[PDB]
């Protein structure tokens, strides 16, 4: 029954989801600059999805009678060494988001805030996919190496994402 | 071929459109906090629309051969004295966005960047609608004054925005 | 931001577009009077179209924050020497309408009223069609000459205008 | 009111568009000859597109009251050293096309020929896509280098163009 | 199989078909200059068709393993004394075309190039229609003489061609 | 512009595909002799399919303007120690065919004969299925050993092939 500490922690996480969106938008611009439009498209859809994660939590906080406060969204990095390094960064970033969602879950249960626990279980399950989807692309890119035809094949797969 | 100056200016405007979106999202939280879900709905539509403004320019910059650089999105104000004050802030903000667009249009003309000039005409037209829509709500709020039943009539009208 | 000078000029042009309509309605009566019901139809369609030209500008003036003032609509002439003379007048009239639109365009450019400038571009494009459509009929009526059978063929063709 | 000079210049551009088509049709022959049917298909589409560009300006010139004069279409080159070299020539050719459309735009601004100026804005925008589309393929071929499997992957992509 | 002799002769016929197209494009501008939009429609459809006759041969040469070489397209005549004179010129040009097609047929057969012989039969049959359609309109214009309504009736009939 | 060398290598592979068919027909007669009419059926289906492989390549060489030259089809072996040994011969024969296909593919790429490369990709993918199908059956026959009912069960399953 929503505490100030919970609302603050969720507002910080709204900020981290928007930051996640903006990181991937910056990667969209990186992949565009190196001609990989399929990879770009993947990042743009991820930036759309992260903003939906944020908005789902924005509505939740407000539905619970809490007040959403918005914080600065930081300037994201703009360059990566390669496609592999970008997706390794996606994976480590998402692993980190996972850690934060788990601390939120533990904070909810500590306060016996069952509505927040139940609402967060959606993110727990979405984090499982985020990490697996990023990891699978890291592994493909590791196999691919410098094979250009394979890089383009993957770029076409990623094109299809909606 | 687009100049570095013109790319930097569009990049700063992409940032101003994202901040616009973010201002409106902050307003949405303010309207929720005062029990005006219709006004809040209107702001949430406007936040999606400003992000569309931003992405149209984001795609144009790279289509032109330029590189988008993303900057920090500043923490927006979070309180307004009244619905009327919020919408006066919307109107003044949009008038100043128009000033920024027109300065872009001038800088394109000065550089004979016909491509950018042409592209920006969409924003010139769009700001006419932005300023009018805001101003119409300011004028209704002035006509309404402190009549709260008429405020809630407007609130219902705005909840219909899609 | 839209100047009083630009408003007044748009208001005079609205008057000119309604007078155009009224001039074509008068020609319609003239063509009925000499048994050319197709020519009459063409003028009735043109009267409806000029009114649409006027209303589009009517809506723009308030959208920009100005106020439309409506002025008297002048009594139009009512006889022409021939179908050709009537259509040469149509063509010259439209040529003069174009000159007036291009003058608004210049006044908007001089004021850096980009909004109004962009809006006027539709009228720019539309006068191209207006001049050519009239001129095509003028040219046919010159080719036709005094051949009344050919005149009536043209009358039946114009009766098809929707 | 459309000037002789502006007519000529537009007639010469109609020629340049037809030659563009023809050059692309030559490149389609070349691509067929080295067994790249997708690249050939892309060039056939582009030949049809350039003729549409030409026919748009052909129609405008007579709609403005001018007279199209048709000039000889020059023999295009028939061979390139590589697919990459053909597409570098596409990009350069389109950048040079853009320069001529922009000169047309200034000649229109200079003569206060707003009607032509406005009609040319379509070609301004279309040259943005024409340059980007060609540069994207140039950059792809530079990434592909000598990898013939990757080249054939790009050849299949380009088959899809309609 | 296909000989260099046969390819050269087909490449020159591809040129002649394109020149046919371009000739008919020139006549389109002529008819447009004298206000006959139906006639001009007919000439634009013919230009499209002649280009299709050309592309059909272009694709055949290439399918047979031959190489299409494109040559310059010569500046067509731009003026005729009358509609009748323009259609007599159509009729005579197509008569000459039919003679060259019959010559190609004979060359194929002398060479025992049975694939080319069979392919050109399409053109044999098509030249039958081309000549007859042109001659039908020549005879119609001959009857019409100076009758203005009859000229305008035929013009409308020709406006229906697609 | 398919080379003489490529044509000869393809003719040799037509001969190899016909011999493949003939080998399998001989294995049909063998399986017939030891009473396994499902195994026989599988071999007759394979004989028919290898003949289709051959005829697809016969048609390709001819469609490219090349000339198919047919060579002697050698006498195949007529006896095998057991069903297991027949299917191991099948397996190793197909692995040998795969190796010949990969050499044709590399010749094609060496010559930049992309139409032959692309055609050959059908055989590359078919050879994957051929090896897998034969190996699956080898593996089942090793598990089977001398178990009479398991052999009969596998025989009935091979009966069903069409
Ligand atoms: Zn997220
Ligand atoms: Zn995520
Ligand atoms: Zn905006
Ligand atoms: Zn806005
Ligand atoms: Zn009008
Ligand atoms: Zn008008
Ligand atoms: Zn073009
Ligand atoms: Zn182009
Ligand atoms: Zn023809
Ligand atoms: Zn013909
Ligand atoms: Zn086979
Ligand atoms: Zn096989």
CB D86 within 8 A of CB D36: no
**Nearest-angstrom CA–CA distance, D128 and D107:** 20
Distance C100 CA to ligand 5 centre (A): 11
Nearest to B70 among A51, A69, A76 (CB): A76
B102 interaction partners in chain C (CB closer than 8 Å): 112, 114
Interchain CB contact of E67 with C (< 8 Å): no
- Say which residue the tokens 């993110």 belong to: A123
CB contact residues (below 8 A), chain F span 95-154, against chain D: 109, 112-115, 117-118
> Which tokens sit at D110?
């200079």
| Ligand 7 centroid to residue C130 C-alpha, Å | 27
Work out the angle between the directed axes of helices E114-144 and E83-110 (0-180°, nearest 10). 160
Say how many CA atoms lie within 13 Å of A56 toward its Cβ: 14
Of F91, F70, F83, nearest to F16 by C-alpha is F70
Indicate yes or no: CB of D119 within 8 angstroms of CB of C135. Answer: no
Counting every residue, how long is chain F?
162
Measured over the CA atoms of residue A142, residue A146, residue A149 and residue A155, the dihedral's sign is positive
Short-list D43, D48, D57, D47, CA closest to D123: D57
Which residue, B38, B39, B120, B47, is CA-closest to B84? B39
- Distance in angstroms (rounded) separating the CA atoms of residues B123 and B114: 15
Q: Which domains occur in chain E, in start order? A: 1-162 (1.20.1260.10)
Distances (CA, A) of E71 to D11, E103, E107: 21, 20, 21
Cα D59 to Cα D17: distance, rounded to the nearest angstrom: 14
Q: Which residues contact A92 (CB under 8 A, 6 or more apart)?
A: none
Q: By C-alpha distance, which of A28, D97, D130, A43 is closest to B64?
A: D130
List Cβ neighbours of E17 (8 Å cut-off, separation of 6 or more): E50, E51, E53, E54, E57
**Ligand number with the minimum distance to the CA of F91:** 12
CB A10 within 8 A of CB A66: yes
> Which phi and psi (to 5°) does residue E140 adopt?
-60, -45
Quick one: CA dihedral B43, B44, B49, B52, positive or negative?
Answer: positive
The torsion angles phi and psi of D147, rounded to 5 degrees, stand at -65, 105
Helix ranges, E34-113 (H): 37-63, 83-110
Smallest CA-to-CA distance from C145 within B4, E161, C153, A77 is with C153
Task: Say which residue the tokens 């539509």 belong to.
Answer: B45
Chains that touch C (3 or more CB pairs under 8 A): B, D, E
Do A25 and A40 meet the contact criterion of CB atoms below 8 Å apart?
Answer: no
Q: Tell me which residues have their CB within 5 A of the ion that is ligand 4.
A: B 130
Q: How far is D64 from chain F (nearest CA, A)?
A: 50
Q: What 8-state DSSP symbol labels residue D82? A: S
* DSSP codes of every residue in E94-150: HHHHHHHHHHHHHHHHHTT-HHHHHHHHHHHHHHHHHHHHHHHHHHHHHHHTT-HHH
How many whole angstroms separate alpha carbon A146 and alpha carbon A138?
14
Residue reference for tokens 């931001």: C1
- The torsion defined by the Cα of E65, E129, E143 and C160, in degrees rounded to 10, comes to -90
DSSP state of D147: -
Distance set, CA B95 to CA B134, B136, B143, D84, E99 (Å): 10, 14, 22, 48, 72
SS3 E36: coil
What distance in Å separates the CA atoms of residue E68 and residue D48, rounded to the nearest whole number?
18
- The Cα–Cα gap between F56 and D92 comes to 43
Q: How far is the CA of D57 from the centre of ligand 8 (A)?
A: 13
Q: Is F129 exposed, middle or buried (0-12, 13-18, 19+ CB in 10 A)?
A: exposed
Which DSSP string corresponds to chain C? ---HHHHHHHHHHHHHHHHHHHHHHHHHHHHHHTT-HHHHHHHHHHHHHHHHHHHHHHHHHHHTT--PPP-PPPPPP---SSHHHHHHHHHHHHHHHHHHHHHHHHHHHHHT-HHHHHHHHHHHHHHHHHHHHHHHHHHHHHHHTT-HHHHHHHHHHHTT--
Categorise residue E35: left if φ over 0, alpha if ψ from -120 to 50, beta otherwise.
left
């Amino acid at each position: 029954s929503i505490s100030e500490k919970m609302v603050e922690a969720l507002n910080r996480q709204i900020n981290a989801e928007i930051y996640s969106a903006y990181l991937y938008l910056s990667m969209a611009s990186y992949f565009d600059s190196i001609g990989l439009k399929g990879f770009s498209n993947w990042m743009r859809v991820q930036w759309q999805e992260e903003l939906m994660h944020a908005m789902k939590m924005f509505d939740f906080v407000s539905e619970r009678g809490g007040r959403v406060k918005l914080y600065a969204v930081e300037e994201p990095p703009s360059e990566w060494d390669s496609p592999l390094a970008a997706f390794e960064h996606v994976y480590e970033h998402e692993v980190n988001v996972t850690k934060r969602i788990h601390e939120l879950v533990e904070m909810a249960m500590q306060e016996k805030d069952f509505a927040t626990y139940n609402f967060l279980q959606w993110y727990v399950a979405e984090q499982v996919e985020e990490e697996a989807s990023a990891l699978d692309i890291v592994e493909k890119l590791r196999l691919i190496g410098e094979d250009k035809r394979a890089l383009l094949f993957l770029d076409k797969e990623l094109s299809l994402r909606q």
